[PDB]
mmCIF file of C-alpha atoms in Angstrom:
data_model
loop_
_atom_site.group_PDB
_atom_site.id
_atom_site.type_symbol
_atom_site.label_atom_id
_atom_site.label_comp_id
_atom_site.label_asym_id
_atom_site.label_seq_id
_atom_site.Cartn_x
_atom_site.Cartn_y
_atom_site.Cartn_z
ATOM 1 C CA UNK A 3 55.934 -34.972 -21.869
ATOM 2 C CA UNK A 4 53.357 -37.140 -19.864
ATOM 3 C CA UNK A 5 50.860 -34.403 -20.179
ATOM 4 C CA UNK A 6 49.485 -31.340 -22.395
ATOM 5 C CA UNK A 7 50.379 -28.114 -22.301
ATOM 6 C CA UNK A 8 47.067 -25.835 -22.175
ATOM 7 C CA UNK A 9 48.324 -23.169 -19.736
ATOM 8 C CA UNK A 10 45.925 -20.975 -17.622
ATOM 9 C CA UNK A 11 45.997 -17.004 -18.013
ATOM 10 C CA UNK A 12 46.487 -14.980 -14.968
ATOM 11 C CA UNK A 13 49.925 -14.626 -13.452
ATOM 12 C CA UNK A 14 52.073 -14.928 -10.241
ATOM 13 C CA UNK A 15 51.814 -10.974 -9.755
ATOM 14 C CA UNK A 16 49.784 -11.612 -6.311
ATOM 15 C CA UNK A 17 48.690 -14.250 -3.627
ATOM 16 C CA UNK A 18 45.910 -16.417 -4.301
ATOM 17 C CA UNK A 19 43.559 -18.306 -2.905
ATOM 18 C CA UNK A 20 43.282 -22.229 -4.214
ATOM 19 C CA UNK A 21 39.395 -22.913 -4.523
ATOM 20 C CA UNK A 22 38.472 -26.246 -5.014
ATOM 21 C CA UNK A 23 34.342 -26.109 -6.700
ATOM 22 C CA UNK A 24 33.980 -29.914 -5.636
ATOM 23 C CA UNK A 25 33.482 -28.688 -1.623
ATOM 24 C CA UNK A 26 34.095 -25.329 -1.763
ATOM 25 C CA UNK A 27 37.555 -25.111 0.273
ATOM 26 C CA UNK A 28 40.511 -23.344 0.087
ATOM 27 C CA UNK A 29 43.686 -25.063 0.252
ATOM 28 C CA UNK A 30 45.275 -24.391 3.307
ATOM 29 C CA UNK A 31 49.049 -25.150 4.926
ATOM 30 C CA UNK A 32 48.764 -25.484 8.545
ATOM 31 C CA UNK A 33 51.603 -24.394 10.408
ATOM 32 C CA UNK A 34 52.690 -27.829 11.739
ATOM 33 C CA UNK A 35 52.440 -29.120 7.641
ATOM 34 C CA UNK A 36 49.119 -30.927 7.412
ATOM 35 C CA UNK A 37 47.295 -30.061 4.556
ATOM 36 C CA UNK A 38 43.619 -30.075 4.228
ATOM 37 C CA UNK A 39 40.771 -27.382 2.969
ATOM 38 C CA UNK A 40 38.721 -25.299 4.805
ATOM 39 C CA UNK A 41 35.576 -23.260 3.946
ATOM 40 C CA UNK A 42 36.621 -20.364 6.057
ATOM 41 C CA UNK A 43 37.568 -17.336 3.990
ATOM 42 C CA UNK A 44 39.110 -15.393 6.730
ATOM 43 C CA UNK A 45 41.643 -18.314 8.059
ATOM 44 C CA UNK A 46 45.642 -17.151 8.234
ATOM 45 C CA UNK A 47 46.691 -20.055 6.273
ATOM 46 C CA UNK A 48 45.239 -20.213 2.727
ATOM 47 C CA UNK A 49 46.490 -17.431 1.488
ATOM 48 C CA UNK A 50 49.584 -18.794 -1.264
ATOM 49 C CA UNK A 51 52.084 -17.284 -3.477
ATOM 50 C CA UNK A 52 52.614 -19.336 -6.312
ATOM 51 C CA UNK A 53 55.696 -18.711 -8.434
ATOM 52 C CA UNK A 54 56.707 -19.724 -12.138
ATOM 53 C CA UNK A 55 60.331 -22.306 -11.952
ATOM 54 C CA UNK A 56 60.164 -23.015 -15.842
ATOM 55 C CA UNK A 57 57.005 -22.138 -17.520
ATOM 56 C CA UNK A 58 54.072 -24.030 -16.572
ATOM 57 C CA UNK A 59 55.848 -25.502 -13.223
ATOM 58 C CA UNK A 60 55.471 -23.872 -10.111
ATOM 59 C CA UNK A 61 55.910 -23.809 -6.391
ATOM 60 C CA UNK A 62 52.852 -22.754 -4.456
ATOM 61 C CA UNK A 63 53.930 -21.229 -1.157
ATOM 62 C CA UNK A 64 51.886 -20.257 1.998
ATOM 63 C CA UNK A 65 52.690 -16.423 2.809
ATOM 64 C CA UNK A 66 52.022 -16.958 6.805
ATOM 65 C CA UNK A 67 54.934 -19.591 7.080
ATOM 66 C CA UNK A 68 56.809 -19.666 3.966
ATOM 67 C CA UNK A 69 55.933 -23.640 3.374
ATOM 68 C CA UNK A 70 55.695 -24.970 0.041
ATOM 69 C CA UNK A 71 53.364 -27.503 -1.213
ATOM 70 C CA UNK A 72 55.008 -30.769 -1.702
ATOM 71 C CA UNK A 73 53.151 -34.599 -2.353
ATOM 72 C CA UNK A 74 55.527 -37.210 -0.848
ATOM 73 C CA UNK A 75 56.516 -40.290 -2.253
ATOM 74 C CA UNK A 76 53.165 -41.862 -1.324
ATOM 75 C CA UNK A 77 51.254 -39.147 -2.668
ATOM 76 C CA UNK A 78 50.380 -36.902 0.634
ATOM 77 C CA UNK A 79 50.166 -33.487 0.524
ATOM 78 C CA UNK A 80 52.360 -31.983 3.062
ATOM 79 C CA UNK A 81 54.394 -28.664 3.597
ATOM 80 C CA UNK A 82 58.063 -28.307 3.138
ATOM 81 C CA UNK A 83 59.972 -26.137 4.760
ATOM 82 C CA UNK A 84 62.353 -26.180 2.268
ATOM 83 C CA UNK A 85 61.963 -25.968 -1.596
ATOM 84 C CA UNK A 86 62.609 -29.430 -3.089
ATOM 85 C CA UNK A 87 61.300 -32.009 -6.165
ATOM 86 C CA UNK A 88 58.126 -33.079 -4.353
ATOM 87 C CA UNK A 89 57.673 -29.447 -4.274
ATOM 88 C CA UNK A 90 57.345 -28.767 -8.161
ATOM 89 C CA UNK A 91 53.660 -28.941 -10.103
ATOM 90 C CA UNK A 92 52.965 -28.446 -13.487
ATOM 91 C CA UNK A 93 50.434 -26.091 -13.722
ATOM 92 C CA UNK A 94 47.796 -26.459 -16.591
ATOM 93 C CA UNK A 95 44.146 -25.314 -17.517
ATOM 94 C CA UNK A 96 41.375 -27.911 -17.449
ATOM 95 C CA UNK A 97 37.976 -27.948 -19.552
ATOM 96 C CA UNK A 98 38.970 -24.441 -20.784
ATOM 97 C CA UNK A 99 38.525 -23.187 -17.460
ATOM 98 C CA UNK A 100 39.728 -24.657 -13.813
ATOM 99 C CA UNK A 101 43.573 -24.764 -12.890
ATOM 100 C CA UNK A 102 45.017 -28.268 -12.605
ATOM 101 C CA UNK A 103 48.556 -29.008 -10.580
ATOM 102 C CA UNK A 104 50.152 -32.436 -11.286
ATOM 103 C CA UNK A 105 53.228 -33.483 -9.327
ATOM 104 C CA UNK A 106 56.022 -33.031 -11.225
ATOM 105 C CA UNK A 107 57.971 -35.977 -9.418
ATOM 106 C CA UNK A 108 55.300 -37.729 -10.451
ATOM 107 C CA UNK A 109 53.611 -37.113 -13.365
ATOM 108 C CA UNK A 110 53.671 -40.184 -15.195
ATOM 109 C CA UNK A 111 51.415 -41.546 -12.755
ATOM 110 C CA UNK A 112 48.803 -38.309 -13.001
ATOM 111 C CA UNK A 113 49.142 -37.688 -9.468
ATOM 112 C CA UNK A 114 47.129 -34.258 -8.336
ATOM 113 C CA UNK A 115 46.868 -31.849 -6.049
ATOM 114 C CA UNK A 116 42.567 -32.576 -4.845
ATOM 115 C CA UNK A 117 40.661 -32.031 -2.471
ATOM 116 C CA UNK A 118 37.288 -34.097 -1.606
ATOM 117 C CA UNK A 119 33.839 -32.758 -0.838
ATOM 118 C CA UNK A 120 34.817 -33.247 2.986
ATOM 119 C CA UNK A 121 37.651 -31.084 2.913
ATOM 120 C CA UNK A 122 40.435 -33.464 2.980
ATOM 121 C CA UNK A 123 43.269 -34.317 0.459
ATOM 122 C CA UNK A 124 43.084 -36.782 -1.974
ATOM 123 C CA UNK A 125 45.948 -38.752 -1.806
ATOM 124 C CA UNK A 126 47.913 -39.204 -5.367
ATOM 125 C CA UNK A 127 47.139 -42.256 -6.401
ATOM 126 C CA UNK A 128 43.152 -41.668 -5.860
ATOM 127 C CA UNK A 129 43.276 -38.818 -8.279
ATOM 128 C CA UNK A 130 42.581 -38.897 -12.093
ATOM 129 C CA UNK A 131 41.986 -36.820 -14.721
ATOM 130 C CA UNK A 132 38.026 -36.198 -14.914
ATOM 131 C CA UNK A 133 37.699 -35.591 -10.983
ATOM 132 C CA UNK A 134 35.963 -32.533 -9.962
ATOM 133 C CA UNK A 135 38.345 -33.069 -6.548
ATOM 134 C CA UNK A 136 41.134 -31.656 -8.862
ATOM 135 C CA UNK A 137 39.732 -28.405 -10.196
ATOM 136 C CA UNK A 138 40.577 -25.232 -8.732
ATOM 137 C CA UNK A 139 40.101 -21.604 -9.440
ATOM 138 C CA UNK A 140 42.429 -19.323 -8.078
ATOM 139 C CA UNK A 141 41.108 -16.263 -6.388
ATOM 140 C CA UNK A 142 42.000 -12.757 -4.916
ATOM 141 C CA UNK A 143 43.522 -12.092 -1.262
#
């Protein structure tokens, strides 16, 4: 392993929202597979399923169009029609709180799922453990 192995509580029962505290957005999956956040609570597209592969790795999927989550090979977030490696992030609590979500392609370079105060995604490489861009909460539909 690259990484620890605090896991967060909650499960995959039901759909979740991905709050990021740095700007207050929700992940969202647009339909033609950019990725960005948006403040908007009521928006079709930030509503995500996220289900277990192995414990503590997980696919996060959008429930309006079935695409997955994936960070590409130069670490931007896109969505995937189709379930593949890019797809897979390890899922782990941070400061005994937040949820974390680390590529699993590429871990040993502590690439994240983030998003900035603006609302866009970080891209891998920019993100690092300590960032407040990389701390989400999940929340109810």
């Amino acid at each position: 392993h690259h990484h620890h192995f605090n896991l967060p509580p909650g499960n995959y029962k039901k759909p979740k929202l991905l709050y990021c505290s740095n700007g207050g957005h929700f992940l969202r999956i647009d339909p033609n597979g950019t990725v960005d956040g948006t403040r908007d609570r009521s928006d079709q597209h930030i509503q995500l399923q996220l289900s277990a592969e192995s414990v503590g790795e997980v696919y996060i999927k959008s429930t309006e169009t079935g695409q997955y989550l994936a960070m590409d090979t130069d670490g931007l977030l896109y969505g995937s029609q189709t379930p593949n490696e890019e797809c897979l992030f390890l899922e782990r609590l941070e400061e005994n709180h937040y949820n974390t979500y680390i590529s699993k392609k590429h871990a040993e370079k502590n690439w994240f799922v983030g998003l900035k105060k603006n609302g866009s995604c970080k891209r891998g490489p920019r993100t690092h453990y300590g960032q407040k861009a990389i701390l989400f909460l999940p929340l109810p539909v």
